[PDB]
Fold:
Amino acid sequence: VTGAVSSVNMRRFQRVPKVSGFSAKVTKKNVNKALDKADMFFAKSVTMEGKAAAIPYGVYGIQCMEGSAKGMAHEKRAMALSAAFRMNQRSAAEKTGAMYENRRLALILAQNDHQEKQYIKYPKLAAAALMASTEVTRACQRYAVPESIEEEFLAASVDKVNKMRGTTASGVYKSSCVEGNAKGQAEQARVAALAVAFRSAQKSASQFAAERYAQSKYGRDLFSSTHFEEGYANTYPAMAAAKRASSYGY
Amino acid sequence: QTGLVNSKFSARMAKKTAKQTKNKVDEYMARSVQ
Amino acid sequence: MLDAFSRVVVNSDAKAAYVGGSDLQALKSFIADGNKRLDAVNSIVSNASCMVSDAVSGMICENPGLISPGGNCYTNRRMAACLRDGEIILRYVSYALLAGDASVLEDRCLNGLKETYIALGVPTNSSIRAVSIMKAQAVAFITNTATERKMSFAAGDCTSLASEVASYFDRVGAAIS
Amino acid sequence: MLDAFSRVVVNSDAKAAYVGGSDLQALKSFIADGNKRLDAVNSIVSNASCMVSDAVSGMICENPGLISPGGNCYTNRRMAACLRDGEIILRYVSYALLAGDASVLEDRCLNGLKETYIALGVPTNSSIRAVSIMKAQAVAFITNTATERKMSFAAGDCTSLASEVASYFDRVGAAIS
Amino acid sequence: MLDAFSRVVVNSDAKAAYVGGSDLQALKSFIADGNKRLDAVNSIVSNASCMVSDAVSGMICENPGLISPGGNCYTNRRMAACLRDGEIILRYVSYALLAGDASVLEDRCLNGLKETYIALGVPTNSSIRAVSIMKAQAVAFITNTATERKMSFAAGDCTSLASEVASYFDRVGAAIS
Amino acid sequence: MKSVITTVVSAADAAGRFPSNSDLESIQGNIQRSAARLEAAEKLAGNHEAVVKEAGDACFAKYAYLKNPGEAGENQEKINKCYRDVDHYMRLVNYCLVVGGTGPLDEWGIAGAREVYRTLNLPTSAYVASIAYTRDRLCVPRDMSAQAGVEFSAYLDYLINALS
Amino acid sequence: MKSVITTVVSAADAAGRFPSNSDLESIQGNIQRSAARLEAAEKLAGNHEAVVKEAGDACFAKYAYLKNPGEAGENQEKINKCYRDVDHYMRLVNYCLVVGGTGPLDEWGIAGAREVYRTLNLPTSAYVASIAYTRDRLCVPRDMSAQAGVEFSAYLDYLINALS
Amino acid sequence: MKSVITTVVSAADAAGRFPSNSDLESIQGNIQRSAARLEAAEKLAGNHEAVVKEAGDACFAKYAYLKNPGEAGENQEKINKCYRDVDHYMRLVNYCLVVGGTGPLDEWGIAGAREVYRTLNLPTSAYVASIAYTRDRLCVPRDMSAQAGVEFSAYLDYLINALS
Ligand SMILES: *C(=C)C1=C(C)[C@@H](Cc2[nH]c(/C=C3N=C(/C=C4\NC(=O)[C@H](C)[C@H]4CC)C(C)=C\3CCC(=O)O)c(CCC(=O)O)c2C)NC1=O
Ligand SMILES: *CCC1=C(C)C(=O)N[C@H]1Cc1[nH]c(/C=C2\N=C(C[C@H]3NC(=O)C(CC)=C3C)C(C)=C2CCC(=O)O)c(CCC(=O)O)c1C
Ligand SMILES: C=CC1=C(C)[C@@H](Cc2[nH]c(/C=C3N=C(/C=C4\NC(=O)[C@H](C)[C@H]4CC)C(C)=C\3CCC(=O)O)c(CCC(=O)O)c2C)NC1=O
Ligand SMILES: C=CC1=C(C)[C@@H](Cc2[nH]c(/C=C3N=C(/C=C4\NC(=O)[C@H](C)[C@H]4CC)C(C)=C\3CCC(=O)O)c(CCC(=O)O)c2C)NC1=O
Ligand SMILES: C=CC1=C(C)[C@@H](Cc2[nH]c(/C=C3N=C(/C=C4\NC(=O)[C@H](C)[C@H]4CC)C(C)=C\3CCC(=O)O)c(CCC(=O)O)c2C)NC1=O
Ligand SMILES: C=CC1=C(C)[C@@H](Cc2[nH]c(/C=C3N=C(/C=C4\NC(=O)[C@H](C)[C@H]4CC)C(C)=C\3CCC(=O)O)c(CCC(=O)O)c2C)NC1=O
Ligand SMILES: C=CC1=C(C)[C@@H](Cc2[nH]c(/C=C3N=C(/C=C4\NC(=O)[C@H](C)[C@H]4CC)C(C)=C\3CCC(=O)O)c(CCC(=O)O)c2C)NC1=O
Ligand SMILES: C=CC1=C(C)[C@@H](Cc2[nH]c(/C=C3N=C(/C=C4\NC(=O)[C@H](C)[C@H]4CC)C(C)=C\3CCC(=O)O)c(CCC(=O)O)c2C)NC1=O
Ligand SMILES: C=CC1=C(C)[C@@H](Cc2[nH]c(/C=C3N=C(/C=C4\NC(=O)[C@H](C)[C@H]4CC)C(C)=C\3CCC(=O)O)c(CCC(=O)O)c2C)NC1=O
Ligand SMILES: C=CC1=C(C)[C@@H](Cc2[nH]c(/C=C3N=C(/C=C4\NC(=O)[C@H](C)[C@H]4CC)C(C)=C\3CCC(=O)O)c(CCC(=O)O)c2C)NC1=O
Ligand SMILES: C=CC1=C(C)[C@@H](Cc2[nH]c(/C=C3N=C(/C=C4\NC(=O)[C@H](C)[C@H]4CC)C(C)=C\3CCC(=O)O)c(CCC(=O)O)c2C)NC1=O
Ligand SMILES: C=CC1=C(C)[C@@H](Cc2[nH]c(/C=C3N=C(/C=C4\NC(=O)[C@H](C)[C@H]4CC)C(C)=C\3CCC(=O)O)c(CCC(=O)O)c2C)NC1=O
Ligand SMILES: C=CC1=C(C)[C@@H](Cc2[nH]c(/C=C3N=C(/C=C4\NC(=O)[C@H](C)[C@H]4CC)C(C)=C\3CCC(=O)O)c(CCC(=O)O)c2C)NC1=O
Ligand SMILES: CCC1=C(C)[C@@H](CC2=N/C(=C\c3[nH]c(C[C@@H]4NC(=O)C(C)=C4CC)c(C)c3CCC(=O)O)C(CCC(=O)O)=C2C)NC1=O
Structure:
């Protein structure tokens, strides 16, 4: 049996930080690794408390179906995880644009000053609060139902503006708005989204009436600095439910 | 999802609007009088 | 509108089948207790005038908010409309029990009634209760178990027709809901 | 949304007229009793918490059919929602009285409310009564004629602001009708 | 975010002290010269459009390497983003001078700005100079000592507000450093 | 804290605008009304020992059942912590008279109160009884001036409406 | 229109709050400043004949090249439409003096101007030349009062900064 | 850069598809048209001394007011920077003739130009005057061939339409 002492790398994790030296630099990078795990806990919390509104009474509502055919939930993981991989392939212009764009919108929906200070300090928490805010009050486009064909065209115009920021200034498609990753996965996405379009028309008479006023308020609070924009939000709520935060490319 | 105008295949949002159910009240109200 | 005989004809026309001997056991049994069906319809249409004023007054002593000021049965005009509304539903249910099929009930009475009572502001809770009291009177009059009127009948069993009219009344109630 | 100042600006913009000295007699009189307008709004928002539970309970002792089984205020959830849209209507009326113009009332609160209450089955008779009791409380609180709360004010007349808020409340009532 | 009034409230809340008469000499002097603070903010927001193109062009005249090929202000897109910055920082400094407290400056503008400019490759030395020229324009516009624009003011002294905005600008500069 | 200042510059920051004439015009009312709303501040700050004293026993005089065993004020230290809460609420009203808005109330007494008062069995009616007893005992020329009394009562009833 | 009123009740509506004391306090400045900002309104409204006249020829005196063929003011009807634009902008400044904010300017002259002036080859420098010529010709005791003149110049330079 | 290549493989990448026959067929036109569009590239690259010279003085001949004090070309170094901009734009047109699309123009001259030209008071009409003067002086058998002239003029007028 040989005589093997503990190596030096096995002993460098027991050290004490000294700020006066260069050993401050390794406890730079030891700390933002922990402060991203903090953010991934913060966003995980704020996702779950909003997500608890889709099941208000212990029974799963029809808002969070995922799986109408036999393998539709197993491909949904492959959609979402590849989208999360491509989310951090953006360059330093887009990430720092999206962070400061989310800080203009999280700061106007927060009520107390600590809640706005939290979205200020942690950017993933501010990314998740904006999502959970549009999920519990269904002002997303995946739940917005137009009423007349007038308002359907009125929502199509805003959506055509929103798709244009999914391409570059040249006209080349950006890597954000992408609908496939493999062979036949875009067809799987097309079959997956029409079921959600049918599930949004199966709401109750109370839920349609609630999300009408929630969409008008979302339109006139976040994307209206003028009187004509809020006049459009007050009459066509589905038009107001098609304005994204612009942190998304699509 | 995206509206039917751009990048979209088949027709959607087959849901009862208030105008259509107003017409369905009205046709019954006419039939009762007839 | 259809009846019990034509109901199996649209079922056979869906497959271009002739009505054979399998299909006629249900219809020759419809003929055997046809006299019980006429005797059951005659008991309902005899006391149909008491049944509406029985049921609507029961719906009132349920809920005095209908005769409250501003209530839905507050005016003489509204009470008459409600009384007239109660006679129409009892008429179409007795049509459906006579025909042996619920078809004439839900394209001439219940088709478009929900939206109508929503547009008028007619409260649906009391509409359910006015129909359920009439259903309870129907099973009592068919099985000859009313408290203070007994009718002469030939002896035998009649719970099948009572269950049929009970099946028509909750069709009415689920339609107006 | 608009206010009292911009209301005459859209009236002058319809004819490309400058706002002259004729138009400013209505607005310089809006400034003279502006302190009475702030003193009138402060009296309403002080007792706004009592006003909803005052009015909704008055609407209940009007009509016990709302707390009847199947009634529109029968559940705790439905009673909380009724106490919620009492407060929303009182909030937007106090916005309109503060602004001096009814514009923020009928594109953010009343636009689309009638077909919402028709689609929900909310009875409009009691909706009128819950607004009228709040209107009667508003004229009592502005003119300082409540039974058991008197507020300190400088002496003078205030029936013009009371008539203005009375004009906003029947706008609400005619909208939900 | 906080202002000058709430700044002493969080100082008193740290010891559960009531705000007494000692604390209000600093705040009643904040109100006494309240007209000079509004007159100082109005002079900055009037010439804020000239101030950015003044400062960024001064930053160019000193270092031609920014408009050099490959430089940080070489593209029209990059020049527009730098002019977009010159305005956001001037906007938040005018917020902080209006509020009388630097709190809204360093959690909405400067919190996370240094590592943003490090991650983008934005030159820090060049940045400092764009902020210092805007600071020099701010002290000239508050004390009414610009070369070719003089604004009408009531006579009196204003070096305290000029020193306050000079104290905000090197807070910005030390933050981006 | 929500005040006259922090409202108009966050509305300007959300729109990306410089402070316009409405933003300057809103602070002009903060010059007029601060003569009245600050006069009640030192009046409450100097005599804050008799008001807590006069509200605390009125709370227990309305509700004598709180001193029963098993209730909220059964022993002495619980009554000591009960008077501390009325002192806290009067300190927050003193702060809100100084900022000029309902900032410190909404941050430090209102947000999350409806959870802790239900979890720890504190009856909110006994909380609003003391604030109402402070409210009706305002002699409008004797305690303070007229407008200072209006500004004081408008912050007392805001806390009353928020607690119920 | 962005004014003192429409700012504080949309901040209250976005939070779902009743009008608090800050909301009432903001409108108190709309009582003080409206004596000064309305005094310039009828002064501009009564003498709007000569201000447009004195700005329009100063625009063409700074830029005489606009009357060349192929340019913006080559013929008579184009100069007639050019004076109409300065009349429009002075009417919007008159409106903004009445509302008390930059509402009507931002809705009717500012939003979308940078597209139509580039599409129709209208030089924005010639637009701001007339507004600057109106700005430096303000005799502060002769045209109006002191406060008024400040409120008028603050709306002229806002349009100058927004057009450039 | 938007070109024939980068369009068809990002349309394939967004759909998750391999390069199909349409993707290969689109690059076949990049073989035919590149004989014409590259012939103008060295023609502009070798004689870029005189085109900038002949465009810059035509810009100031159309607009002689720019040399006035207070204007954009008042001193010598501003005119030196003005000729540098026409050299930049002709270099970007030379690049776009080489890639085969409007990539380098849209990235380096078009995006963000409408902000810097309004902020620094640069008149866009004087920018498009030089490009139009380059455009009408194309002798179609003498400067280059016919199709090279078509490809050159189609990139000049794209910049003209984008700047106005
Ligand atoms: C390049 C080497 C270089 C410049 C470009 C130029 C820029 C510059 N200007 C100052 C000082 C001021 N700048 C001001 C801004 C403006 N002046 C105006 O009158 C209008 C309103 C506005 C732009 C349209 C102001 C007000 C001053 C203060 C003095 C004054 O009365 O003008 C500096 C800093 C100090 C200095 O170097 O002069 C710079 C860099 N100067 C250049 O050197
Ligand atoms: C949002 C990203 C985007 C922008 C911007 C844009 O212009 N187009 C999209 C990306 C994109 N997608 C494709 C091809 C397909 N996309 C789908 C999915 C859609 N079909 C559906 O049925 C639904 C939901 C109900 C969606 C989203 C499909 C099925 C294809 C075809 C797949 C294939 O193998 O051909 C393309 C390529 C060009 C095109 O538009 O078809 C792009 C750019
Ligand atoms: C104080 C505590 C302490 C320890 C626990 C060890 C563990 C340890 N092993 C290695 C290093 C190594 N460790 C392994 C071990 C293994 N690889 C396998 O596939 C097996 C699963 C496993 C053996 C059972 C190997 C193969 C290397 C060499 C890697 C290399 O040379 O590239 C190193 C890096 C230093 C070096 O390169 O030698 C350390 C710290 N040493 C310590 O000082
Ligand atoms: C607890 C709260 C709660 C939610 C938020 C939702 C959460 C949720 N999001 C999505 C799925 C999604 N959700 C969004 C979000 C939005 N869509 C938009 O257009 C807007 C920008 C935004 C609303 C504010 C998007 C873009 C997807 C598609 C992602 C994907 O399918 O890969 C799905 C199912 C489909 C899938 O993931 O494949 C679910 C269950 N459910 C919940 O129970
Ligand atoms: C609170 C108010 C109130 C009323 C007004 C009465 C009304 C009433 N009667 C019946 C129940 C009935 N109601 C009738 C109807 C009639 N009976 C006859 O003998 C006549 C022919 C005819 C009216 C003249 C019949 C036949 C029954 C079944 C039991 C029976 O009467 O033998 C029911 C349903 C079951 C029940 O509650 O008993 C109600 C609500 N009862 C009430 O509780
Ligand atoms: C922006 C403006 C705005 C409003 C005015 C309110 C009004 C309003 N109330 C309800 C919803 C409701 N509103 C009522 C109210 C009443 N029923 C009665 O019998 C009384 C007459 C009245 C109370 C005094 C009830 C009981 C419900 C619940 C219905 C249900 O749960 O089925 C809904 C549908 C959403 C939901 O289900 O909660 C809306 C939009 N909400 C708003 O956002
Ligand atoms: C049948 C059921 C029934 C009720 C529940 C009460 C409710 C009620 N109160 C008022 C009438 C009023 N209601 C209030 C409201 C209040 N008064 C206060 O002093 C408090 C501040 C606040 C509740 C705490 C006010 C101020 C008036 C006007 C008269 C007054 O109280 O001085 C009215 C309208 C006119 C009237 O009928 O008197 C009604 C219906 N009355 C009823 O008939
Ligand atoms: C920031 C908050 C804020 C307010 C709450 C109001 C407070 C307020 N109200 C009035 C003043 C007044 N308020 C009233 C109103 C009334 N008197 C009555 O007897 C009626 C019951 C009621 C009618 C609705 C009257 C009549 C005056 C005096 C006339 C006037 O000043 O216009 C005054 C002027 C007198 C003074 O106090 O100096 C003020 C400042 N202003 C503000 O700036
Ligand atoms: C909320 C606060 C807030 C800010 C302070 C700004 C600051 C800011 N600027 C940029 C982005 C930029 N900022 C600059 C600015 C400069 N480079 C220089 O050499 C000069 C020193 C300076 C101008 C004076 C440039 C040139 C870019 C573009 C970098 C690029 O496009 O690659 C970005 C990244 C987003 C983007 O790409 O646009 C941010 C957050 N934006 C904000 O939202
Ligand atoms: C709504 C918009 C709004 C404003 C813009 C200000 C406008 C304003 N400024 C001052 C008044 C003043 N402003 C200044 C400031 C200065 N004087 C100088 O010579 C220096 C250059 C500069 C220092 C920064 C001084 C010294 C006074 C007089 C002292 C004072 O009133 O405090 C006054 C009081 C005198 C008066 O005009 O009646 C007013 C109303 N107030 C407002 O309500
Ligand atoms: C900054 C604002 C602020 C407050 C408002 C209070 C609110 C408050 N009160 C208590 C805690 C308590 N509060 C009370 C008070 C009362 N019980 C009654 O019956 C009456 C209604 C009232 C006295 C008049 C009592 C008796 C306890 C002790 C309960 C316990 O210990 O479980 C606690 C738990 C921690 C503690 O013991 O302090 C808190 C957070 N504290 C604060 O920091
Ligand atoms: C409500 C606000 C409002 C405005 C500001 C103007 C803005 C404006 N001007 C013009 C149109 C024009 N505007 C001008 C004006 C000028 N050309 C110059 O060189 C000078 C800078 C300026 C005169 C001093 C000219 C010459 C035209 C005619 C251009 C054309 O017909 O193509 C048009 C096109 C329609 C039209 O002919 O009216 C519009 C919308 N109109 C408005 O409704
Ligand atoms: C890669 C593409 C690219 C461009 C197109 C230019 C665009 C451009 N021009 C200028 C800057 C300038 N551009 C001009 C040019 C002109 N003024 C006129 O009246 C005529 C229209 C034109 C000459 C024909 C002048 C005079 C300046 C100096 C303005 C100033 O310094 O404020 C600047 C500011 C920095 C600098 O001085 O360079 C930029 C980014 N630069 C680039 O990097
Ligand atoms: C990050 C990409 C990603 C996902 C999202 C999930 C998608 C997902 N959900 C599932 C399964 C599932 N999905 C939901 C609904 C949904 N889930 C919830 O926790 C709440 C609150 C919901 C909306 C009401 C429920 C309630 C179940 C449990 C069914 C069961 O256990 O029987 C299953 C298992 C399917 C199966 O076993 O056949 C998958 C793969 N997985 C992924 O990889």
